[PDB]
Amino acid sequence: TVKIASDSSYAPFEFQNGQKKWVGIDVDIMQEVAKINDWKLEMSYPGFDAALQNLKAGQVDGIIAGMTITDERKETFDFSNPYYTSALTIATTKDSKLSDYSDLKGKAVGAKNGTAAQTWLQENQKKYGYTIKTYSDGVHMFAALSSGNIAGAMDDVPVISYAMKQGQDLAMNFPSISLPGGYGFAVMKGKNSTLVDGFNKALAEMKSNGDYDKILKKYGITA
Ligand SMILES: NC(=O)CC[C@H](N)C(=O)O
Ligand code: NA
Ligand code: NA
Numbered sequence: 001t002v003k004i005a006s007d008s009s010y011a012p013f014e015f016q017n018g019q020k021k022w023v024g025i026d027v028d029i030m031q032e033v034a035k036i037n038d039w040k041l042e043m044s045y046p047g048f049d050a051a052l053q054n055l056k057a058g059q060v061d062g063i064i065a066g067m068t069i070t071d072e073r074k075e076t077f078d079f080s081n082p083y084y085t086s087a088l089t090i091a092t093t094k095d096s097k098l099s100d101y102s103d104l105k106g107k108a109v110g111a112k113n114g115t116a117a118q119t120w121l122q123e124n125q126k127k128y129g130y131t132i133k134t135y136s137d138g139v140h141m142f143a144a145l146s147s148g149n150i151a152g153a154m155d156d157v158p159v160i161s162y163a164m165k166q167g168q169d170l171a172m173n174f175p176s177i178s179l180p181g182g183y184g185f186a187v188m189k190g191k192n193s194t195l196v197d198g199f200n201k202a203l204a205e206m207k208s209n210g211d212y213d214k215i216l217k218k219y220g221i222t223a
Contacts, residue, residue: 001039001040001041001042002034002039002040002041002042002061002062002195003042003044003059003060003061004030004041004042004043004044004060004061004062004063004064005043005044005045005046005050005051005054005055005059005060005063005065006026006027006030006043006044006045006051006063006064006065007045007047007048007051007065007066007138008045008046008047008050008137008138009137009138009139010024010026010048010065010066010138010159011024011159011162011163011166012024012025012158012159012162012219012220012221013025013026013027013064013065013066013084013158013159013183014026014027014045014064014065014066022043022045024219025084025215025216025218025219025221026064026065026066027043028215028218029064029083029203029206029212029215030043030064030185032202032206032211032215033185033198033199033202033203036198036201036202036205036206037198037201037202039198044060047136047137048065048066048067048112048113048114048115048136049112049113049114049115049136050136051063051065052114055077055186055187055188056076056188058188061187061192061195062185062186062187062192062195062196063185063186063187064185064186066084066156066158066159066183067183067184067185067186068086068115068116068156068179068181068182068183068184069082069086069181069182069183069184070116070119070179070181071181072119073186074189075189076188076189077186077187077188077189078186078187078188078189078190078191078192078193078196079181079184079185079186079196080184080185080186080196080199080200080203081184081199081200081203081204082181082182082183082184083182083183083184083185083203083212084158084182084183085178085182085183086116086156086178086179086180086181086182086183087156087157087158087176087177087178087179088116088117088120088154088155088156088157088176088177088179089154089155089157089160089172089174089175089176089177090104090109090152090153090154090172090173090174091142091145091152091153091154091155091160091170091171091172092145092151092152092153092170092171092173092174093145093146093148093169093170093171094169094170094171095169096151096152096171096173098151098152098173098174099173099174100174100175101124101127101128101174101175102128103151104128104129104130104151104152105128105129105130106129106130106131107130107131107150107151107152108130108131108132108133108149108150108151109121109130109131109132109133109150109151109152109153109154110132110133110134110135110141110142110144110145110150110152110153110154111132111133111134111135111141111153111154111155112134112135112136112137112138112141112155113134113135113136114136115155116156116179117153117154117155117156118132118134118154120154120177121154130151133149133150138155138159141153141155145170146169152174157172157176158221160172162219162220165220185199
């Protein structure tokens with residue numbers, strides 16, 4: 001088998017539909033990577049930093065979870081070629097009057113544990129003077145956002161946008177931070193090299209034959 005761990009709630013990359021079924025961009029791509037490569041694919045959805053721990057323990061073989069490729073992360077993981085862009089911004093409720101990172105001084109800002117959002121928040125904390133609240137789970141972070149206990153939640157643009165499209169009480173009034181790495185498939189550094197190659201080879205074939213484009217189209221994304 002090939003065991004891949006993912007997030008539990010990260011629409012449109014992985015999420016459950018109305019019949020409790022796991023769907024999303026990451027799900028469609030990984031299933032297709034497995035078919036093209038003839039892998040028995042065993043997906044699990046424990047959560048992002050849960051998936052990180054399962055990967056480092058060897059309980060799974062790699063991760064697909066909207067995971068941003070970063071230079072720092074490249075010291076623990078090997079990544080595929082990117083298959084999506086990676087950008088961060090502040091979600092707020094619709095009725096929020098905050099719009100700039102300078103507004104967050106002396107306020108509590110959420111981030112999911114182990115993520116590029118938490119890293120950026122940590123790197124820019126002295127600059128803007130917010131306090132960082134951490135949650136492993138996106139459900140907990142956005143519950144805090146809705147409850148008013150955090151002034152904003154940093155997360156990835158496509159995920160906030162998608163849920164805004166679902167009519168959730170969310171707005172994107174802040175500038176976005178573009179991260180250069182994009183999203184990749186990740187394995188432990190020096191391990192499972194051929195999973196990365198298989199991912200790369202299938203992804204190129206999916207771009208050239210147009211299956212990649214069709215996956216993004218399913219979820220409302222113009223590529
Ligand atoms: N599933 C996630 O929350 C991933 C968030 C972000 N792209 C990261 O890589 O940390
Ligand atoms: Na980087
Ligand atoms: Na970063």
